[PDB]
Amino acid sequence: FLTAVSSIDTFLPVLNEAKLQWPTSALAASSEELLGGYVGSQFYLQDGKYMQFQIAGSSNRCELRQMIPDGGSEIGWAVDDGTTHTATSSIVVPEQVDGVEEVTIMQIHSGEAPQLRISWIRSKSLDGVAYEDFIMSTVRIGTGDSSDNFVKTHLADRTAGAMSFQIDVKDSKLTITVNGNVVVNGQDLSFWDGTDSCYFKAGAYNNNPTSESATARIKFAALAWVDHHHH
């Protein structure tokens, strides 16, 4: 039988501050249900160690969505609210099967748009350089679809071992640290000033696959939302 993520101590802090959405944005498990052993092939403990997300289908997801702790409701914060908002993770991105082209593994999202997507991507040109098998950030600086609304950055080539991420938002600015190295330093997010519905996500969100049956798979060794206020 499949082992539940909550059978070990490692992920209990974040499971106390999340709901699981799967296979769409519909609720699959509340925080309480995650803490009490919710399990399936989309969401289980691998190697006794990794919180593993699996999902097939274009635009489908298996993702944790940040919640107020202790059974609270959806959280909502702002890039300019004066608080530092922090998420950390340690992620093993395995080699993906044929048909999977891009998997979003962390997000800053609001009521209506993704401010930040960190995604694995099989192949893409950025700024006239061709890159393969890598980790990318996509930041939105507007709501339109032309290329001027996005800032896209090569963060790192995918490694076989765990890669660590820290995301910080303070005073309308975004910083992304990858394996201890600051790669994105103070990206402007002031377009989003006043939007007070932002929240973190993490897991697997499958983008533009070429087969809807191909299963994306991501393993987390650590994940936390870091409260700079200690309630």
Ligand X SMILES: O=C(O)C1=C[C@H](O)[C@H](O)[C@H](O[C@H]2[C@H](O)[C@H](O)[C@H](O)O[C@@H]2C(=O)O)O1
Ligand Y SMILES: O=C(O)[C@H]1O[C@@H](O[C@H]2[C@H](O)[C@H](O)[C@@H](O[C@H]3[C@H](O)[C@H](O)[C@H](O)O[C@@H]3C(=O)O)O[C@@H]2C(=O)O)[C@@H](O)[C@@H](O)[C@@H]1O
Residues that bind ligand X (CB under 6 A): 21, 25-26, 65, 74, 109
Is residue 150 exposed (0-12), middle (13-18) or buried (19+ Cβ within 10 Å)?
Answer: middle
Distance CA 174, CA 182 (A): 11
User: If binding is defined by CB under 6 A, does position 109 make contact with ligand Y?
Assistant: yes
Could you give the 3-state DSSP secondary structure of residue 212?
Answer: coil
Q: Name the residue whose CB lies closest to ligand Y.
A: 114
CA angle, residues 155, 160, 163, in degrees to nearest 5? 45
With vertex at residue 11, the alpha carbon angle to CA 63 and CA 55, rounded to the nearest 5 degrees, is: 25
Q: Which does 26 bind (CB under 5 to 8 A by kind): ligand X, ligand Y, none?
A: ligand X
Q: Which is nearer to ligand Y, 9 or 112 (CB)?
A: 112
Q: Which stretch binds ligand Y (CB under 6 A): 77-85, 87-95, 203-211, 218-226?
A: 203-211
The SS3 assignment for 217 reads strand
**Mask of contacts with ligand Y, 206-225, x by CB under 6 A?**
-xx-----------------
Of the pair 76, 114, the CB lying nearest ligand Y is at 114
3-state percent helix, strand, coil for the chain, nearest multiple of 5 = 10, 50, 40
Query: Is 47 strand, coil or helix?
Result: coil
Binding segment (CB under 6 A) for ligand Y, from list 73-81, 106-114, 121-129, 191-199: 106-114
Q: Is 113 in the site for ligand Y (CB under 6 A)?
A: yes
Residues that bind ligand Y (CB under 6 A): 107, 109, 112-114, 138, 140, 150, 205, 207-208
